[PDB]
Design a protein around this nucleic acid. Sequence first.
RNA 1: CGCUGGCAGUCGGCAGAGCGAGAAAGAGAGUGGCGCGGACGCUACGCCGCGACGAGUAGGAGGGCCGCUGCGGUGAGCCUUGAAGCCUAGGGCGCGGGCCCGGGUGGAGCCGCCGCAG
RNA 2: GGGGGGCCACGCGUCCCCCGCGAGCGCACGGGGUCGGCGGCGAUGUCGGCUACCCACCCGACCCGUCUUGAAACACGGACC
Lengths: 124, 128, 4, 109, 225, 44, 216
Amino acid sequence: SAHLQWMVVRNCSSFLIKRNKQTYSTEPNNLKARNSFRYNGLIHRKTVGVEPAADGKGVVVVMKRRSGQRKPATSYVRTTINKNARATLSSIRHMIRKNKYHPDLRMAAIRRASAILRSQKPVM
Amino acid sequence: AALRPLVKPKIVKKRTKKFIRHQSDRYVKIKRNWRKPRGIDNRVRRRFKGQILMPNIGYGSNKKTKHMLPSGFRKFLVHNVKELEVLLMCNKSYCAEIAHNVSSKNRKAIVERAAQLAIRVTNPNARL
Amino acid sequence: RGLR
Amino acid sequence: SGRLWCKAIFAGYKRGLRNQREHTALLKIEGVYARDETEFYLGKRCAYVYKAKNNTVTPGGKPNKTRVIWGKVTRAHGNSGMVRAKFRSNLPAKAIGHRIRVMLYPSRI
Amino acid sequence: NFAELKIKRLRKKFAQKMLRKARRKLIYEKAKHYHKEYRQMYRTEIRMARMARKAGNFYVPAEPKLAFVIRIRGINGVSPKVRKVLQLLRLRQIFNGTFVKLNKASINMLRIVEPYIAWGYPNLKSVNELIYKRGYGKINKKRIALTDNTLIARSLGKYNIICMEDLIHEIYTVGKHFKEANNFLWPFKLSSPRGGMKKKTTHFVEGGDAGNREDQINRLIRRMN
Amino acid sequence: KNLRIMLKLNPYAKTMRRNTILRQARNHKLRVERAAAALAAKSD
Amino acid sequence: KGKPHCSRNPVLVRGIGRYSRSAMYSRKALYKRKYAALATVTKPVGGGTRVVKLRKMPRYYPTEDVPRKLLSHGKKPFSQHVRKLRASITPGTILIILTGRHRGKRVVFLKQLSSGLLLVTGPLSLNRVPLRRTHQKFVIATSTKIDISGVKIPKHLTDAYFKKKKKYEITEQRKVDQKAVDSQILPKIKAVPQLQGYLRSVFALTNGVYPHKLVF
RNA sequence: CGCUGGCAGUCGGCAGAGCGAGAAAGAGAGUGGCGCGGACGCUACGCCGCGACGAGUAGGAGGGCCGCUGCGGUGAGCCUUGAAGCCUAGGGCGCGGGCCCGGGUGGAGCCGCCGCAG
RNA sequence: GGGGGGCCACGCGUCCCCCGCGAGCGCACGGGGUCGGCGGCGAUGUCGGCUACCCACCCGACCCGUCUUGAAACACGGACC
Ligand SMILES: [Mg+2]
Ligand SMILES: [Mg+2]
Ligand SMILES: [Mg+2]
Ligand SMILES: [Mg+2]
Ligand SMILES: [Mg+2]
Ligand SMILES: [Mg+2]
Ligand SMILES: [Mg+2]
Ligand SMILES: [Mg+2]
Ligand SMILES: [Mg+2]
Ligand SMILES: [Mg+2]
Ligand SMILES: [Mg+2]
Ligand SMILES: [Mg+2]
Ligand SMILES: [Mg+2]
Ligand SMILES: [Mg+2]
Ligand SMILES: [Mg+2]
């Protein structure tokens, strides 16, 4: 279970960094990038990831389907959102709230998606 | 155009001087690093008036402002570009220090990525 | 019920 | 056109005999020598005015050699017109026996 | 539907509001009667003295049932028998004060701790000042400030002591539940006496401080409280 | 020192502080007319 | 739809009314006063009709926020504070300015403005002090008064009239109210002997002069 | 240190936002007379809240994201666009053990985390 | 019990001994501070830097380790790295 493998990965994971009195995670689907049970991107059956697109613009939203859990090749579905800064914030919020897909990560997903769009702006 | 933190509380430090070792002034063999005196007649561990103070637990900094730089940020050591996407969601409270063994060619790329990720660098003009 |  | 401050002497710090507390200064204002005459000076603003080598910015004026440690009378001291004052930085001990100013503008009358 | 649930929760909230108002009226008229009891107790002792002086005899007042005890020395160099009594009086620190009811078993302990304390007979205003300003309750072995009457009523409500006025009444007139009412109060953490002590090391009748100052404990109470 | 805290702990203190103000004002009004009648007694 | 009425009990002291609960019930007469029992908008275009949203959702969220703060009750803004003024400062008195560029100058007090500051013009033919505010803490109030009760101060002399804008040049409005106030102040100080010369002088401390020994 | 305290209730258009209050127990079921919206959290070995307390030789125990060397794993770790070491009136963090950056010197290797060993 | 001032008293309809939801509106000694208040200076001489370099002054202040009831000891060990 998720709790069972969290008790393995809470201290001896390869994504874990412990320096400068802080702890984080370099996990691929860890939004907010911190080491915790709620935000861990691989122990749960339903995970949400928000990443920048392969090219300059857009936000890729990744979910994990419920069928293939031991099958990591076809486990994650990926969508690309190359739109304005507000309809993507409505879209990801809809994808979480209306689908009831791991609902305690919706504001974290919106806050990550805003940061990616801010990072894709021209610098001053 | 400085990068402000989320909040900037007033930092209260109970002591700003170092805790020097007893009799680290009469000798070069005695370094400045603190050693607790354990002699039978030692006038410092007996807390006589007008002597070198001892590092008690009462000097401990406030937990809200502990490990926090005078710019209001806390610090994270960064070795490569990948360690900044770690810090992008902790943006307004933690900043980056590029490590000393990082070369100038990669150090340029780290601060270039930190500028667009809006992460503050304590040493952006380090090596060049 | 005294105040109605 | 004339003096607007009262003369005081930095007599010393608030102290016992074998301990001294540098965050409170003992002040001897000229003309007051009893406790029934020192309630006028309570709450007034103190000024240690001195001169240094480097120039510092002057509020409403050109930069000059003059700089001041500001302070305030807090309470009466002793029984013979001495007062206690607290300053924002503790007073240097080279000013013992020297003039400081007690202003009038924190005025209750 | 929820239209019955909302009005049911409103009636519950209304019942909670009327139960609180009836309790506040009860506290008000309890204090109003305690005022009359204090007036009767003050005027009766004057009346009984006057009517004895008219006939030419003497009126002997009853010795007071209540005393206030203040520890007036430190914890260095203390005899063991005296340490045990100073702990049973809950005076573990200098300038601590407590209310002690008086009997033979109490006078024979205050005689043992006599050079280390300064006790006396408190005024009604002294009890008012002490309970209102320094009143802390011992609730779940925690020193809790008496900021609301519920704090008293939750612990002493089974002895019908439900406010500050009931607490002050049960302390001043030593009642049935005086032991519970006094043990509910934390020992009073009082300051140093303003003005100064006369002489800590000697008895009060030797021009010092220790022992029994009968009517003059209030003069120490105002300068120490 | 805090009136509404005192009323929170003791609602009867409102009337015990309205009295010892009203009767003090009335007794002060009595003593000043008594002293003014003394000044008229030393004038007549 | 009732006409608003004042409080039916006087302030005996602060926080305590003069009449009690039942007496106040009787004065108010409640014995015969018993009782018993958006976001969107429609807009057309030229296809269909749009429900245009007012206060649309934000386009950006920061990474972290500060939480809301607890509620205090006694904390009011400066425009709602009560203005205290000490009993020695009454309209018409003579003040000594202690802290401006007009140090030690004797001036005439007119009125206290809405900010609490004092509106002062010790006359410009005597002091070179204009219609100007000063703070009452930094002012020595001398016990020397004139009758000023028939002096018509203009109504536009307010806090906003004396607030700074941003070389400062004199304006003709400030020049004509300066003449208008002084023309009715100056004959009232020229009646008292030596008062204009007293105003033209500057207060100072000399040897042996201690402010706690002398009365003002 | 104690309360062997509190928080899995983030229970959301499959919704109804609570358990501080003087008084053992249920905001219980049935049976008859437009606008698609709602901060943070929870490394539970974590976070939060109330009180009380703080001397120390000999000695005992606990915690060290204190320090040194080597090994198994791990950082798609660092490095001749400059490693170790050394120097520094430079900037700092930590109560402290100590540590991280800046400048110089130097020319080839070195470190962080999880465990192991001396 | 009979014939001027304060009252946390203001129902109607009985039996009877003593003779369970009114709405609103603001003010605040009310579960720990705010201002919906302001003023001065700032590009080659000035602003900030508590700590760290040197110096000055006041108060304090005997050299450590060890044995010992007791060490600053005219008790032993100790130039420095
Ligand atoms: Mg010894
Ligand atoms: Mg000069
Ligand atoms: Mg002794
Ligand atoms: Mg005194
Ligand atoms: Mg003795
Ligand atoms: Mg200890
Ligand atoms: Mg050096
Ligand atoms: Mg000395
Ligand atoms: Mg030896
Ligand atoms: Mg011997
Ligand atoms: Mg021994
Ligand atoms: Mg020795
Ligand atoms: Mg000797
Ligand atoms: Mg030997
Ligand atoms: Mg030797």
